[PDB]
Design a protein around this ligand. Structure first.
Ligand SMILES: [Mg+2]
Ligand SMILES: [Mg+2]
Ligand SMILES: [Mg+2]
Ligand SMILES: [Mg+2]
Ligand SMILES: [Mg+2]
Ligand SMILES: [Mg+2]
Ligand SMILES: [Mg+2]
Ligand SMILES: [Mg+2]
Ligand SMILES: [Mg+2]
Ligand SMILES: [Mg+2]
Lengths: 149, 77, 224, 188
RNA sequence: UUGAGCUUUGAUGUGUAGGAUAGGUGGGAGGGCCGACCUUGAAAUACCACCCUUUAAUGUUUGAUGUUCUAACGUUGACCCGUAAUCCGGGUUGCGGACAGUGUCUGGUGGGUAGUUUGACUGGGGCGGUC
């Protein structure tokens, strides 16, 4: 399925490109999330001759805003007080939703689907390391401590 | 019924034909599949029971065109 | 080393037809002495299947005459009628004792169904392992042996079995008429595909090369 | 491949049922009062050599097969194959490992052994009942304290092992019965 | 992560007996030294030919599962709404996840079901025999 890109994607190419992609991949993931548009001649001209400047401005402004948000969530410390048993070992596993709304309480305005924590659950008390996928090319780190309430 | 909401592919009847030409009735069924399509014009997800041929027709003709054609035909989606 | 004109003129990429490099066969040679011409032939053969055996003799005309060493077994007046065919040892089980002695001169062994009795158990491990048995599909044990021996010693080039898929027979001396050798080489299909084993594989005659002793390398087409 | 009907074939026929040669050994035909006739044949699978039991229907029937046996004479072995020959046609022939199973140790050279060939091809060879063989290895028998017969293990020039009485030493030809794998006499 | 093939550069087969440090099969006197001759087996030896047996560099044609992921799809998990509703739909969320399942084609099994066949003569018919 010939498709025109509206953004830099993983292993296809930069924007403003003509790539042959599988129909399923184009239909289910790319085109719903704006990352591509089918290579109809109308869209080819509409994009190349008319949009390939404005949408580029928007893309770079967004990349800059996301690097800004990465700079802004550089407080690098956020407190979490949840219920835990003895020997640490939280009874209730704190989660991505909890981390997100806690940092929004004390920090940046960030969505719940944004945080990307590697260890998976955060079942115990203590200092933990969580990553933040704010933009497809830039990440962020926060030190999250879980104090037993 | 098993009818592709885009084309209109119905179950057609035919024959089973053996090696000795013994004919028995049978049906051919259209490869129907429930699928949610992303209508960018409406920022919405619409669910049509399409065949695979209908999926390809939508790929080629754009979803909003097919939806307008359905509204013209008088078929609630 | 003077064995490198061959490697100059080895064309493995450009395969030739029958007419192209036939005249160059001795122009590709640097031999001290004189030799013959060999052939390259193949056919799908279940290494496993034994019902794939074809023994006999192939009469290839227009060439070398009595240059073969034969051992014969006859009973009766044919013991003297066979000496009229220029045969070497037309005799009795004394020839079997010669084989026991470990004789390497005689190569093709012939009999007659009356005296075949003598032949089979005699040199029994020896002759057949020597790839020289005496089946009847080939007529190496006849009743009218006068009418066949003059041919078997005159002009016959025998087909052989090999453990490998290889089946490469022999043509005659290098110095014969090259065009006529082409016809002689062509006169082999009518028999090499006269009797298959009915379990032939993908193709019939995959290889076709004409090497004389070690000199010529003429790869050819299966059809032409 | 004349088709054969159940109430027709007695023992000896070589039926070809189900892509497989057989050999009717015994058959009992029954015609009861008020019912379809049948035959209880004592078949014989002719490739693995096991006896199968089949009740055949008057109507149910099978094609014949070219399974035949005559007296071939062993010649030589080479690699995985055994070659034999006729004394009335002198037709050459080659078998395989499957055909010579456990008769490898019984055939020497020139033995006249009946072979079953099918599709013009051997499937089973039967070694002559008694074969004269020579012993490759034995422990010099010493009576020692033996009070009974004792016996002694002895390999042969073809690999086989037989119990030989006590005196047979090395280089003595013995006679064994292929059927029982046992010593019969020391052939002088 | 690898397995089989194909142009392909090459190497490589170790017993008995022959000195052994013989791949097979024909044609078998070629290139400082072998060869044949001779010892020899079951086959006897330089010379290259047709290839088998592995082995290593590319284009190879590729499949094979084995991990991860989410977005298709499933959800007879939980909650919210239509709503005075253990249906249905929509929305958050969790779990599976390109498996499952369905369509066309195809191999197998299939008395579960269906349509049918199962001869004639005959001193009644059957069995026996016969055509
Ligand atoms: Mg009908
Ligand atoms: Mg179509
Ligand atoms: Mg899963
Ligand atoms: Mg499936
Ligand atoms: Mg079927
Ligand atoms: Mg059935
Ligand atoms: Mg029925
Ligand atoms: Mg009928
Ligand atoms: Mg009557
Ligand atoms: Mg009757």
């Amino acid at each position: 399925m010939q498709v025109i890109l509206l953004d830099k994607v993983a292993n296809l190419g930069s924007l403003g490109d003509q790539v042959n992609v599988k129909a399923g991949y184009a239909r289910n993931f790319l085109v719903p999330q704006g990352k591509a548009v089918p290579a109809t001649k109308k869209n080819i001209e509409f994009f190349e001759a008319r949009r390939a400047e404005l949408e580029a401005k928007l893309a770079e402004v967004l990349a800059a805003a996301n690097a800004r948000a990465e700079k802004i969530n550089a407080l690098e410390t956020v407190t979490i007080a949840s219920k835990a048993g003895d020997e640490g070992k939280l009874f209730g596993s704190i989660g991505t939703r909890d981390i997100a709304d806690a940092v929004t309480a004390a920090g940046v305005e960030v969505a719940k689907s944004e945080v990307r924590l590697p260890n998976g659950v955060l079942r115990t008390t203590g200092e933990h390391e969580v990553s933040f996928q704010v933009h497809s090319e830039v990440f962020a780190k926060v030190i999250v401590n879980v104090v037993a309430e | 019924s098993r009818v592709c909401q885009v084309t209109g592919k119905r179950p057609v009847t035919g024959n089973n034909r053996s090696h000795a030409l013994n004919a028995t009735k049978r049906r051919f069924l259209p490869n129907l599949h429930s699928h949610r399509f992303w209508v960018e014009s409406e920022k919405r997800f619409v669910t049509l029971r399409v065949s695979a041929k209908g999926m390809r027709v939508i790929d080629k003709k754009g979803i909003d065109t097919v939806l307008a054609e359905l509204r013209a035909r008088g078929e609630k989606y | 080393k003077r064995m490198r004109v061959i490697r100059e003129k080895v064309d493995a990429t450009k395969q030739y037809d029958i007419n192209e490099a036939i005249a160059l066969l001795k122009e590709l040679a640097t031999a001290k002495f004189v030799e013959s011409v060999d052939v390259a032939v193949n056919l799908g053969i279940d290494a496993r299947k034994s019902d794939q055996n074809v023994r006999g003799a192939t009469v290839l005309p227009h060439g070398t005459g009595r240059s073969v060493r034969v051992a014969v077994f006859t009973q009766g007046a044919n013991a003297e009628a066979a000496k009229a065919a220029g045969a070497e040892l037309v005799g009795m089980e004394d020839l079997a004792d010669q084989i026991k002695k470990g004789e390497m001169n005689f190569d093709v062994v012939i009999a007659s169904p009356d005296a075949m009795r003598v032949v089979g158990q005699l040199g029994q491990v020896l002759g057949p392992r020597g790839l020289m048995p005496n089946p009847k599909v080939g007529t190496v044990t006849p009743n009218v042996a006068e009418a066949v021996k003059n041919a078997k010693a005159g002009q016959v080039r025998y087909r052989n079995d090999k453990n490998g898929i290889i089946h490469t027979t022999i043509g005659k001396v290098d110095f014969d008429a090259d065009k006529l050798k082409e016809n002689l080489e062509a006169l082999l299909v009518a028999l090499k595909k006269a009797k298959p084993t009915q379990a032939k594989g993908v193709y019939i005659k995959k290889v076709s090369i004409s090497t004389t002793m070690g000199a010529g390398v003429a790869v050819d087409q299966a059809g032409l | 491949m004349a088709t054969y009907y159940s109430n027709d074939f007695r023992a000896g026929l070589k039926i070809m049922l189900d892509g497989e040669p057989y050999a009717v050994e015994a058959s009992e035909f029954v015609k009861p009062g008020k019912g379809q006739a049948f035959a209880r044949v004592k078949l014989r699978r002719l490739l693995t050599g096991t006896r199968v039991e089949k009740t055949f229907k008057s109507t149910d029937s099978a094609e014949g097969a070219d399974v035949v046996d005559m007296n071939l004479t062993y010649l030589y072995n080479d690699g995985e194959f055994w070659h034999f020959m006729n004394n009335e046609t002198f037709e050459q022939l080659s078998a395989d490992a499957k055909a010579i199973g456990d008769n490898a140790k019984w055939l020497l050279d020139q033995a006249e052994c009946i072979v079953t060939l099918w599709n013009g091809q051997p499937i089973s060879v039967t070694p002559p009942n008694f074969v004269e063989l020579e012993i490759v290895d034995t422990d010099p028998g010493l009576k020692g304290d033996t009070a009974g017969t004792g016996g002694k293990p002895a390999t042969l020039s073809t690999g086989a092992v037989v119990k030989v009485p006590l005196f047979v030493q090395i280089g003595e030809v013995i006679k064994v019965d292929t059927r029982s794998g046992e010593y019969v006499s020391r052939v002088k």
